[PDB]
Specification:
Largest interface: B-D, 24 and 23 residues
Helix content of chain A: under 10%
CATH class of chain D: Mainly Beta
Shape of chain D: globular
Number of helices of chain D: 0
PDB class: viral protein/immune system
Radius of gyration of chain A: 26 Å
Keywords: covid-19, spike glycoprotein, virus, viral protein, antibody, VIRAL PROTEIN-IMMUNE SYSTEM complex
Strand content of chain A: 35-45%
CATH architecture of chain A: Sandwich
Organism (chain C): Severe acute respiratory syndrome coronavirus 2
CATH topology of chain D: Immunoglobulin-like
Helix content of chain D: under 10%
Shape of chain A: globular
CATH superfamily of chain D: Immunoglobulins
Number of domains of chain A: 1
Distance between the termini of chain A: 77 Å
Entry title: Structures of Omicron Spike complexes illuminate broad-spectrum neutralizing antibody development
Oligomer: part of a larger assembly
Number of strands of chain D: 11
CATH architecture of chain D: Sandwich
CATH superfamily of chain A: Spike glycoprotein, N-terminal domain
Largest sheet of chain D: 5 strands, antiparallel
Chains: A mainly beta (about 300), B mainly beta (about 120), D mainly beta (about 110)
Order of helices and strands of chain D: EEEEEEEEEEE
CATH topology of chain A: Jelly Rolls
Strand order of the largest sheet of chain D: 6-5-4-9-10
Bound molecules: a molecule of 2 linked components (NAG-NAG), 2-acetamido-2-deoxy-beta-D-glucopyranose
Protein name (chain C): Spike protein S1
Order of helices and strands of chain A: EEEEEEEEEEEEEEEEEEEEHH
Strand order of the largest sheet of chain A: 1-5-18-7-14-15-16-2
Strand content of chain D: over 45%
Structural class of chain A: mainly beta
């Protein structure tokens, strides 16, 4: 492909996650209930790394990814996931090109700077080879426009037990250089029945550079308490281990706590290291004398 | 690593007798069985005799019944084979095999062998 | 395929008929864990996994939950909570060659026991000691893969055996692998015995336009009792209310 | 009685070939066969006891198989020190320790 | 080696009789025998694979049995389209695919 | 329902060569093995050759070793048999059988056959 070196080197920034990153954990319908669940969630008020100019380096994939972007001309197209991405390990590719949404699992031959060039979209220099293809999926064709910000796109990617689950949400926004404070639920989009081993990924960007900046967060196993409204839409949630007040809310299974004293949990010191103490005897007893005997 | 050395081979006239010995030193001799295996000059191997760990059960090959008498001495770790009334068809090569078990007629095979000793039955010098 | 490279197939969107498998006498071993084989027709399964390989006759017993051995620990491991069926039959008619069929491999040495339901394909030279192999076979460099010497003259225990294992998983997803059951028209406002994708029970069906369920298949209550379902044939939301009862 | 036969008599191969030798019995012996490697210059040695059990201390190149009435010995690598005469012996019937005829193996 | 023999050569029967044909092998083959129906005017067809397994698509009138060294094929009804020559084949020994001699079957 | 049609038969002088072909269209040809079966004018059937699903393992009948060379073409769904150095005892009828398995020497037998093609080796018109 083509190597781009006109990129200023800057340390990654950070942003407050606030109350972003809550999805529907199952396919059952509940309403007017407070349900306690244990699932991989983005912690509230967490530390979210922020990138930018063209910037798309290799990013780790520990247990899940919260990918959030805000643009006005649909500059971002797709993503690449994998472990080595050099025809040695199984890799994934999602591209929402000008034609439709295409997903491939074939083992490609990736260069070090995959990107698309364009207003008409002409350059296609992401990969060179493709062999041992296993899965392929194409969505219905559609025309996608190439030209503060206006909308937010939030995506959640998790890979559990051979299933690749994707969640998404598009919402209007009046902010320019900040992550909004508020709550919004994320409906599930696609469940891919493909068992890839993912530890690394990289995003696509699209010679003139446009205004594009995205945030990345990470999900970890946390217990949450979720409030369903009359219509079954999640409108509020509580991180069960954020602070003692949230722990009290979990214990009472309610979002309102009255004045008083409550018991929440227990305190226990954890061990540091293991200790083994055995006698100093060293002589192998003869199991062979009783096992390798000619006559019983 | 076990050693099995034989002696007593040579040339005798037909109808004469000769004795063989086979000394074992690399293993425990008091609880294993032993056999004698004959190899013709231009044929395959052939079993001859065998003795148990203690001299209770003794068997002989069909062609050598009533002529050969195998013995055993647990004290000096050696066995013997007295060959009597030799004919012209016993000019073969004799080995001193070791049985894997303790009996004579068992599915267990011959585990360790030894270099053969050459005998000859003819009228010459 | 070989043991170390056992093949796996996805099974979904099925009018699945298990009667032909059970009634056939061609399978020497047919053991199901967690499900009675005779009831397989009625159940509906979310997704079906099929794993196929060929093994030695002595090692068919090792394909079972909580079993230890060379092949269970190093080639194919079954979880202790496995649910599904295991099928095995003799394959001397096809996988035996007089000169030796060496197309099948199995793993001998690996660093540690593998987790259940995972595949290892690497052919790196095993390091049993301290001297690095550096990619060269020799002393202290043993190839982990060994070939079965299948021949028509092998004993009954050394005969090649073809093993196909089917695993069923059930969870909060719309079932897509069902059995051969004819669907009947539904009746509303009457205490009936419904059966929606195997979710049997009883109650009074009622048109519930109040619920929405944009993408949810089923609804439920405080206890493990369903409160609303969607008709698989025509997609609308139906409410379930239990029949009246009381003391006398 | 029982009869023991050897299908092959003289074989030719190279340093990097594969050789199989078969031994056939007149009656069923139930996996009770033994294979011996007889070097022409020293004492013969046992390789395989039982149908397919390999004795300790010998290379794993030799591999035996078979049960019932027909048996077969297979060698995988043919190292150049593997020239000898091989015999198959039964230890199951009334005629004790019957040996089959020789099977000369030369490499060329 | 292996030898394959056919006890019967020419048989006579009627439309409503029962006919059995036996095939004998020199050595044990362990239930590995096959029976073929060779029409004189067309290509021969297989009836029984294995010792007593009947191939799909052929009438159940043909029935085979036997194991070890002696085998036998039995026909129950003798429909008048069953005139042909039948061969028995072994697929177990070193001589590959040995065919026995023919067995003519005429109805009178 | 599978079709196996052969050609190339006729009459040639002794010592001359001729080639055979056999086209298969009723089944999947890329993963099955095939054989060639000879039927003497006044004798029983006799096996001649066989090839695997892929051209790796090839075996020949004892009487035809060093003379016949069987081939295979997976692209056009057809196999060939080049007959070289014919003598007077090869005036028989040749079939194109299909193996049940994928290898050459297996307990599996010949499943589907085809009508034979007649060859003749003599000096005539
Ligand atoms: C773009 O940069 C990459 C490195 O980031 C180049 O890859 C190198 O290719 C040379 C051969 O041309 C190898 O010797 C190096 O080992 C490669 N580097 C790495 C890190 O793998 C690539 O060639 C560059 N492409 C262009 C068009 O300049
Ligand atoms: C006594 O029995 C034990 C039980 O296994 C034998 O231990 C191993 O046996 C294998 C078989 O050949 C050898 O390869 C190992 O080297 C043995 N282990 C050790 C630590 O030596 C043991 O060999 C038997 N005793 C004898 C003399 O054979
Ligand atoms: C994120 O981490 C950096 C360094 O660990 C720290 O300086 C910063 O305050 C953190 N931000 C938040 C919002 O916790
Ligand atoms: C495809 O899989 C085969 C399986 O043996 C492997 O040999 C080959 O290298 C693979 N190709 C690529 C491009 O990974
Ligand atoms: C995934 O890859 C990493 C490193 O490439 C490896 O350590 C891990 O075992 C792999 N896991 C699976 C399930 O393949
Ligand atoms: C629920 O939906 C109704 C319309 O169906 C709407 O009037 C109401 O405001 C909604 N309430 C909530 C909490 O979403
Ligand atoms: C699929 O379901 C619809 C529901 O309206 C029904 O009309 C149709 O007949 C079904 N398809 C088949 C093949 O029966």
């Amino acid at each position: 492909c083509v190597n781009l070196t006109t990129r200023t080197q800057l340390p990654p920034a950070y942003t407050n996650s606030f109350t972003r990153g809550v999805y529907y954990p199952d396919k059952v319908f509940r309403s007017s209930v407070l349900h306690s669940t244990q699932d991989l969630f983005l912690p509230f008020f967490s530390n979210v790394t922020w990138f930018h100019r063209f910037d798309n380096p290799v990013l780790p994939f520990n247990d899940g990814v919260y990918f959030a972007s805000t643009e006005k001309s649909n500059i971002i197209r797709g993503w690449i996931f994998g472990t080595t991405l050099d025809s040695k390990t199984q890799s994934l590719l999602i591209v929402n090109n000008a034609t439709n949404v295409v997903i491939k699992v074939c083992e490609f031959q990736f260069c070090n700077d995959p990107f698309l060039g364009v207003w008409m979209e002409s350059e296609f220099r992401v990969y060179s080879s493709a062999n041992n293809c296993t899965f392929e999926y194409v969505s219905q064709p559609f025309l996608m426009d190439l030209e503060n910000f206006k909308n937010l796109r939030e995506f959640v990617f998790k890979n559990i037990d051979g299933y690749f689950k994707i969640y998404s949400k598009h919402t209007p926004i009046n902010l320019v250089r900040d992550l909004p404070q508020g709550f919004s639920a994320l409906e599930p989009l696609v469940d891919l029945p493909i068992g890839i081993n993912i530890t690394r990924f990289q995003t696509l960007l699209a010679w003139t550079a446009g205004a594009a900046a995205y945030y990345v967060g990470y999900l970890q196993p946390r217990t949450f308490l979720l409030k369903y409204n009359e219509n079954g839409t999640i409108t509020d949630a509580v991180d069960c281990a954020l602070d003692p007040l949230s722990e009290t809310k979990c214990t009472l299974k309610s979002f309102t706590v009255e004045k008083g004293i409550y018991q929440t949990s227990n305190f226990r010191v954890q061990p540091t290291e293991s200790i083994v103490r055995f006698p100093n005897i060293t002589n192998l007893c003869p199991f062979g004398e009783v096992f390798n005997a000619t006559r019983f | 690593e076990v050693q099995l050395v034989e002696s007593g081979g040579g040339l005798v006239q037909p109808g004469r007798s000769l004795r063989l010995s086979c000394a074992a030193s690399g293993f425990t001799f008091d609880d294993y069985a032993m056999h004698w295996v004959r190899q013709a000059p231009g044929k395959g191997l052939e079993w001859v005799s065998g003795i148990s760990w203690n001299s209770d059960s003794i068997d002989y090959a069909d062609s050598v019944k009533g002529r050969f008498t195998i013995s055993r001495d647990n004290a000096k770790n050696s066995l013997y084979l007295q060959m009597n009334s030799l004919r012209a068809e016993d000019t073969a090569l004799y080995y001193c095999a070791k049985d894997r078990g303790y009996e004579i007629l068992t599915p267990a095979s011959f585990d360790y062998w030894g270099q053969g000793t050459l005998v000859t039955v003819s009228s010459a010098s | 395929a070989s043991v170390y490279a056992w093949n796996r197939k996805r099974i979904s969107n099925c009018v699945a008929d298990y009667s032909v498998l059970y009634n056939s006498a061609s399978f020497s071993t047919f053991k199901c864990y967690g499900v009675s084989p005779t009831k397989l027709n009625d159940l509906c399964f979310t997704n079906v996994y099929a794993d196929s390989f060929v093994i030695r006759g002595d090692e068919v017993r090792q394909i079972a939950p909580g079993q230890t051995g060379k092949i269970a620990d190093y080639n194919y491991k079954l979880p202790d909570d496995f649910t599904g069926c295991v099928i095995a039959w003799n394959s001397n008619n096809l996988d035996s060659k007089v000169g030796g069929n060496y197309n099948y491999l199995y793993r001998l040495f690996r660093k540690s026991n593998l987790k259940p339901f995972e595949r290892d394909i690497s052919t790196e030279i095993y390091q049993a000691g301290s001297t690095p192999c550096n990619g060269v076979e020799g002393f202290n460099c043993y190839f982990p893969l060994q070939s079965y010497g299948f021949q028509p003259t092998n004993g009954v225990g050394y005969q090649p055996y073809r093993v196909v294992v089917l695993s069923f998983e059930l969870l909060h997803a719309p079932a897509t692998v069902c059995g051969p059951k004819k669907s009947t028209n539904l009746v509303k406002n009457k205490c009936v015995n419904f059966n929606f994708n195997g979710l049997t029970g009883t109650g009074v069906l009622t048109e519930s336009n109040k619920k929405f369920l944009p993408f949810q298949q089923f609804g439920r209550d405080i206890a493990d009792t369903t409160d609303a379902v969607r008709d698989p044939q025509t997609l609308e939301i139906l409410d379930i209310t239990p029949c009246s009862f009381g003391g006398v | 009685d029982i009869q023991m036969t050897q299908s092959p008599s003289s074989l030719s191969a190279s340093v990097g070939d594969r050789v199989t030798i078969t031994c056939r019995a007149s009656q069923s012996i139930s996996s009770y066969l033994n294979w011996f490697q007889h070097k022409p210059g020293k004492a013969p040695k046992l390789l395989i006891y039982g149908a397919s059990s390999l004795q300790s201390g010998v290379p794993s190149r030799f591999s035996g198989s078979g049960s019932g009435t027909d048996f077969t010995l297979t060698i995988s690598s043919l190292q150049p020190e593997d020239f000898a005469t091989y015999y198959c012996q039964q230890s199951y019937s009334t005629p004790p320790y019957t040996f089959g005829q020789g099977t000369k193996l030369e490499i060329k």
